[PDB]
Symmetry: D2
Subunit: 408 residues, 4 copies
Amino acid sequence: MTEIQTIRKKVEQQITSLQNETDEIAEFNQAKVLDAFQENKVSDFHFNPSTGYGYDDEGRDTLERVYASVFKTEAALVRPQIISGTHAISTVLFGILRPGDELLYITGEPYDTLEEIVGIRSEGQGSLKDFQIGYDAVPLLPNGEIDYPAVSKKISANTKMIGIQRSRGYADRPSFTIEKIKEMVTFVKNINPNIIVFVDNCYGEFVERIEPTEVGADIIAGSLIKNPGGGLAKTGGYIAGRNTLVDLCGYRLTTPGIGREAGASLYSLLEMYQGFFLAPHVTAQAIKGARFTAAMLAEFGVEADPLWDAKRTDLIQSVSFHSKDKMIAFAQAIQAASPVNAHVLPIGAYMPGYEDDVIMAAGTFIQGASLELTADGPIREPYQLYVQGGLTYEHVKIAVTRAIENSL
Amino acid sequence: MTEIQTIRKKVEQQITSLQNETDEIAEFNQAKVLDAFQENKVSDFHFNPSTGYGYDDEGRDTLERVYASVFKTEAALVRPQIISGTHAISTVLFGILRPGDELLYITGEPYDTLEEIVGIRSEGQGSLKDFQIGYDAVPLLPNGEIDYPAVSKKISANTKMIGIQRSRGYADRPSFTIEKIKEMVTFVKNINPNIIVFVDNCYGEFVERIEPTEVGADIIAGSLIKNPGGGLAKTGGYIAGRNTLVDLCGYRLTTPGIGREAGASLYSLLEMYQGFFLAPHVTAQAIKGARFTAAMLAEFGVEADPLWDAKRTDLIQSVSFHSKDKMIAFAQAIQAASPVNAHVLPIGAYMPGYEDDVIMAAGTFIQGASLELTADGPIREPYQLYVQGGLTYEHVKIAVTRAIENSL
Amino acid sequence: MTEIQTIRKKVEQQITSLQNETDEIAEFNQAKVLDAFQENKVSDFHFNPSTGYGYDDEGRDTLERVYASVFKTEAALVRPQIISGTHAISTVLFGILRPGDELLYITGEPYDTLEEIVGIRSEGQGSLKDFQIGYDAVPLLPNGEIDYPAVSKKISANTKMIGIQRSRGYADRPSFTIEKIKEMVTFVKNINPNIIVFVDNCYGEFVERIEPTEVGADIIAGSLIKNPGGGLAKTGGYIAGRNTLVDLCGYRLTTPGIGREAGASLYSLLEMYQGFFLAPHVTAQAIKGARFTAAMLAEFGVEADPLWDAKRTDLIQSVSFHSKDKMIAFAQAIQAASPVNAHVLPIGAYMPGYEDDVIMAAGTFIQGASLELTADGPIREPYQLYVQGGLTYEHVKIAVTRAIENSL
Amino acid sequence: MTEIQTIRKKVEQQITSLQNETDEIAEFNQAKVLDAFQENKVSDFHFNPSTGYGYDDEGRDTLERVYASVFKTEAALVRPQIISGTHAISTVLFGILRPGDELLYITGEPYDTLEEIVGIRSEGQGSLKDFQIGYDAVPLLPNGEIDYPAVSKKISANTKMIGIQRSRGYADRPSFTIEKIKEMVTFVKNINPNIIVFVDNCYGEFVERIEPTEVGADIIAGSLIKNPGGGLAKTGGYIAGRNTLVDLCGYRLTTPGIGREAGASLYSLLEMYQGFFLAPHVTAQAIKGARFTAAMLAEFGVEADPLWDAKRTDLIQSVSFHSKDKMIAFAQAIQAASPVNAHVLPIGAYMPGYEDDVIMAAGTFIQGASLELTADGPIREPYQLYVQGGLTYEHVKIAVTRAIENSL
Ligand SMILES: [Ca+2]
Ligand SMILES: [Ca+2]
């Protein structure tokens, strides 16, 4: 019985109860996805490629129906023609919003990439602002909760859509649970039932037994190289929601008069189907992994957020080293414990629009994939490193144990 | 020699000189494309796939540079993410136009699919109109020429872009040659040099030694399942033009902030490169075929448009039988002389937004591809059938001779 | 707390200790495969396709080196040019064996497919017998152990190779553990160290911490649509062993004078790499699944083999219903609880060379894949059904719970 | 007109009549292939992938039937599993031959790669010799014709198969026309009608209106990265012949008991069908190019073989410069006028089993493909360079004119 092994025996026993809970959620979600395959009568011919126009591609259409069934929506859009999560989100915004309309984000300022999209960052690019669509965001209370009086003050007759970002992303606040989201929807719908509630669902898929579309969200969007891709999707994004709303997204994604009826699937179907099927289980690996990281690092006297015993709604997990050297050594050890490009150590790197260098471990099968184990953060006080994902719980245990042995 | 063989010997001698000119154009164009590959140092690594976000895909970028080199533009956008010619065109319009801007098509009303796009066909789908962008079309003169006085009267200070459709499509007018297009461009630029000239270039690629971007067009667009795909591209579209304009198109195709810097190529690069290399030559097969069809049908007392000895700028070829039966029999024979689904008899079919039944031969490798031999037309007087494309001149001669033998 | 749920709470607590052991093995094996990726410096460019001859395909070569590293061999052969497990095995036999040589199987008669291969079933097909290569097999003792005196009697100067089939397959004997195999190797090597020991390793990969190549096997072969494909490999087989021996296999697989240096990888690399990486973990799911099936069925008074508490060396798991109806209802429920073709119920089916109908549940992503959950058996006393595989432990729990609710 | 242009005008007029005959052959062959697609009811579903074992792949089977129809054989084996022409040929030899049998090549010693296969090149690799199969070759007469008395003397009762190599390869003799091959076949069959006649058909496909299987050959084989692949097949080989013989080949390609009934097609079907459809026409480009090269070089006082006005049966074309410098400069110029890796300067290179350095131009889409334009030769007197292939006649004219301009 070694050193670190002793610590592991202890910490693993400690977290076992919560890990078991994660497995209960995974079985529930696995059944849910299986039921969705089944109600849509998925067959092996549904993996066949389409070419050219992609008209009447039943494989593509069936997959979208499977997505809609799982999220409990009327319709979905899940294609490689949606190139990412950001692209999926932008498709929702431009798809629905029209000149004179206003978008209100209530979960505080959303992730930085949306900056140019809404138009508060650049010019001439074709932002919402360029198309006469208004945008604002309501900051969170200091405690990370929604500032309801502030939201109330902001909602006007011109407010067409309310934006909710489930995951904290890089923001210093807790990710919003489905219960918290339900409360937000109830609140806005009580003010105006016609207001469209959109939730940026990235990293939350299959973390709970429920999704935002089950607590009244009208439409949601996410990334296929995160949770729902199950580690297999090579690219893409998804949209799920009301039929009228998904129709609009489709016209934005292709063109009016064609919309979602068109777009060749080529060779992407099998990986999307199989990835979705495995997604509940693979998500469970990343969650189990996060709790392990949180428990182990805390044990080694390192600050963890969230806490190993925190409620979980997404995959996000950070650890604050309060040490530049410790942070870099850890991120490098994570790369060194990765399957792909393990020998290409990350270093402090310049990043456009940022005053601080960033460090990123990304030894993955798919470029930029996040359900896979990665690590990153800005190199500045308090030296917070995001260490999350993992295709297997085994991989996370191995990598984190080695990262500890290497930096602490 | 059989009878038909005797007619062929005569007709083939008659058109030889023109077929030779087509071959001369093919060699010029083949050299143009080769020089572009060399200039851009095309390598086998340029065929490699990219996954995830598709950042720093040199293969994708190099393909784009090759397109730009051939079309003699600063920039190009060429990728699987563009699902068709219509999508390419829409991307140009929404990419460049903004609220208060006006689009003026000068080549008469453009192809029907653009109806919904501009907003004269529906409501609420996110048309140019829905986004406060103005549109109009100047009808052609009765002889099919541009109505210059009408054009002059409709150009205002708010006219941001001029639209030109090279190919006649289904319009009862001749396709516009590069020389004619040059006249148009010179004219509108004389009125306002800052006006953006866009040419829908479908079916015209490699038919002449020059493209519209060489006669003053600022930006062009087309489909990869037509000419530039060389029969090999399974899907896609292209945009080529000035860097500023192509940048704007990129933000529309993806999102602001990202643009053309993202989008996984997956496995599509090789077919696009190889198809483009083969495009000048495959285009020539389709043109030689067109001339054969025109000359043979005329010889059999059937009306052809264009005439065998007409100037050619695109692939479009029609024959008018003034007989329902002959028209149907001929189209059926074309399907029967096609490689794929030869046994699937075309019959009068309903087409959305069409009072008349249509008949179509589409026995192709790629779904809806048109550089391949196809035949189609609405079932009504004067019973005009479009018989065009052909991956090989041999295929067209065989199919057409048999179609004649089966219907006349 | 429901009926069956109560039974599950009980049985799951009971099997927990062994399941945990399976997870320890999985973590060890995950580390082992990770270490193999790392020592071979696996990078994202190693997933790139090769075409034509496939000469100097580093992606293909690196993968084979990763396989060799994991199995602790000098060399391996793992390509889609090996179309299956049977093909892999036959390649080993014809690769090494020459006229006058004799093959001796000591684990009793091997699986039926090898019948034509060795030549004890047909004629003129090019069996070992057709090529003047001898074959025999030593039956097991009644207790399922190796009959060592019988083996000793059989080994002659002409015995070039000894065959060992690790997995019981359909045979009514226990699968041979690695320790048992070590004993066999020691025994034959003591008689003649020059005798080549070959192990058919199908279904045993990653079930223990060790493989036969670690207890002295010279060469091994298996299927990529079983354990090592991790559920992702679309086809294939592998060979691993001594360099001289793998060289010979390569000449058989391609041609002499070329061998393994050639063969295009096309698009198969990523799935093979990623599948191998996930294989320890996915294998663990199928093992955990088997123990669950064994424990649950036994609880419902149904005979299980192996027992939930048996030592495990492969994925094989059966249950004997002593009831035709119960057996068929169970197999059908397994299909109905599968992701693909769930609505296509299996029925009693004729099978060539068999007196009895067979039933097979195979609602899988990959045609004929076995790491995925399936069920099959011959429809005859005692109505033994093989219920094994599972990409996730969750899937197996769900499917088995439903199969019980449906047939018992 | 420039000078070179003046020479071209003259030379092109001179060869026109022969180029026209090539086009006539192209049309005949195109019709032959089209009729085969029709006869076999080729459908778009025939392009669908198969996974796993590849059982009941109708697309794969239909492709095989199309090949058989074109070659006028009972059966064909055409698949990605055959990695080359050599592999196809080896499969035929080991598939049919058995211990005590003898193979007699009558067209002199065949291509070098077959050396190891037959067993006159190495030891222990599993050659025909290692498997107790006899081999011999009858040298050609000095004029390159068959030595009939020597052939008669070497045919015995143990002569199971007669080998005929259509193409000269690197041998200093003319390629054998179908008429010549017919003479050979008639002769050997007169000696023994039960003798199996095999023709290595590489580079000869679609060059004449007839194939060897139409002049008595029992079985033939070739490469898909040459003629029948139409420039599109990324890998592979074919075997066509009598059902009994093709059956035997199947058991060798896979295993006895299984044969041709197995092997996943994955994503290779479409390119194989489309390539075969285009093959007659692409072949014609390469032949027209060959004639252009022969006539142009001769016009410039360089020795050509074959001569511009020679009978053609395959793609092979050489030119002898009697100058190292000119030879090297010309090959370099061909690479520089190639689409892929144009910038990668060919230089004298070592070649295993060759005392002399070789130079090669291989700037192709598919690695090692030869229907595409390439150039190669050993660097030694009389400095003979093979300059052949070409996906388009335009490409050859451009490359060759530039090569002339750069070296002469
Ligand atoms: Ca001017
Ligand atoms: Ca005779």
